[model samples]
Target: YNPTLPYKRPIPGGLSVGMSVYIQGMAKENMRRFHVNFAVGQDDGADVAFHFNPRFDGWDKVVFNTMQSGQWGKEEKKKSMPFQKGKHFELVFMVMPEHYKVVVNGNSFYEYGHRLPVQMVTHLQVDGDLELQSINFLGGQPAAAPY
Candidate 1:
């Protein structure tokens, strides 16, 4: 089933090295920006271990950052925004010991360093201008149950 956008839920056993979170979606034709986040809680102010944001405004770019105690840390940006409006996109975030390798449409996009422990990430959230298809947790000890 294609879940509605702004999907947010707990990663039953939390995230760890070797696990990958896969997302399938389509950017809306009039999209502006969107984000995928690994966070500690469901609430907005909760600490986020990784914040992956892609902006479609002028100077297309993707930004990565962490939110700690409600304050966002320094941003890490990649100018190669691989998403196209009105196009289907497949994204994978592979958890590593020290960072996350972001893959867009089967290509390596960027690596964002771990600002918070991966185990602390209990929830995952996807929001903004896109049509979400599915979110699957793969290659992990306790894979997320089918949704």
Candidate 2:
């Protein structure tokens, strides 16, 4: 994860996956709205976007939105996680076979399942105006028990 260049990659397995990222240098325009997205194809594929919006104040539960059943909808909501505006923050996402566990600033935020098959997620993307300091992915071993 180069600080100067943005990047994306593909993890081979559909088992549990985890990500940690640092957001920095957030400006007024970049605040109040940001997205940590995962998709199957390039560009904002509405069908495959695993959208997570962390509020500017960071007090709300992480929100999950998806375009399943031919409409964009709020699929799930979880509380007690907060993010501050204009500050560097860490966000972690654990992608299990059945659902996602999201953590913000080291605190557990939310858990939501994917409407589409997880195997469709061959491509991973991290993009937005907020400076991305680092990004990581962890996959389960072949011999490990399923999540």
Candidate 3:
């Protein structure tokens, strides 16, 4: 059966450097916020390797961070918001040896430093007000160009 909203999936063979996850989705008209998470496991409380959160409340911004043993770490916030309500978007997470490069709508957005090894990421979670279209695990891709 095809799964919709609040989706979760395992990363086949785990994640590796040079691998990229591509997501295509449309923001809901009433969108408030949404998040994409790379996790070590599929549990509800799994330690997150990286958390990409885009918020529309108060200030339009994106925040990146990690979670371990249920404890959150220091957050890195970006002043720019690449997502808009009722719009289709493409999001990519490119794995690197030291960090993950995030791209939105074909534009390089942010790089999140590794707090946990990328290889440990076995699961993915996408949640919030959006209509997901498709997700692809792209392998053997060339490394992302630096900003």
Candidate 4:
């Protein structure tokens, strides 16, 4: 990832197929939306393997989708939003053989199925209006320091 970046990191040998990652952050006072991305590379306009988007313009929907070849796929939206405005949340994303098991705030919420093999992903990126606190690679191995 570029030094001049926003919440992007390179992991050790990348995320594993059956491992998991975690994200903890805060919803803004008047938050609009926030997203997390898993990518195959970090160069400009890198392809995204998974994209988790939560929009809170009162619709309160969580959108799960993927991007490849610069095209966005159909969104898998949930009618609920555990990530309320002006609140803190901890989300766990566990990689399964065919889908991502998403746990929100200590409860099961959604499972985002893979568009492609998640092993192709090598980086994680975060973006939006919310204040992110931390992301942890919580499998067996720890990652090298992000330089």
RMSD of each: 1.6, 5.5, 5.2, 3.2
Give me the displacement of residue 125 in model 1, in angstroms.
0.2
Worst 10 residues of 2 by lDDT: 19-28
Clashing pairs in 1: none
Which 10-residue window in model 4 sums to the lowest lDDT? 1-10
- The per-prediction tally of clashing pairs is 0, 2, 0, 0
TM-score of each: 0.94, 0.67, 0.92, 0.89
Tens-place lDDT digits, model 3, residues 79-119: 98899999999999998888999999999999999999888
In candidate 3 the C-alpha lDDT for residue 127 amounts to: 91
lDDT of 1: 0.89
Q: Per-residue alpha-carbon lDDT of model 2 for 28-112, expressed as tens digits?
A: 3455555666666544444554777655455554567766544777666555446664566767777766677777667776777
User: Per-residue alpha-carbon lDDT of model 1 for 1-147, expressed as tens digits?
Assistant: 488867897886678898999999999999999999898998877889999999998899999999998899998898878999999999999998888999999999998888898999999999999999988888776754643
Model 4 C-alpha lDDT per residue in residues 1-147, reported as the tens digit of each score: 112226887766677777788888887888888888998788748888889898886678899888899888887899888887888899899998888999999999899888967778888888887788887786645556442
User: Quick one: best lDDT, which candidate?
Assistant: 1
- In angstroms, the error of model 3 at 106 is 0.8
Name the candidate, 1 or 3, with the larger TM-score value: 1
Query: How big is the positional error of residue 77 in model 1, measured in Å on the Cα after superposition?
Result: 0.5
Better of 1 and 4 by TM-score: 1
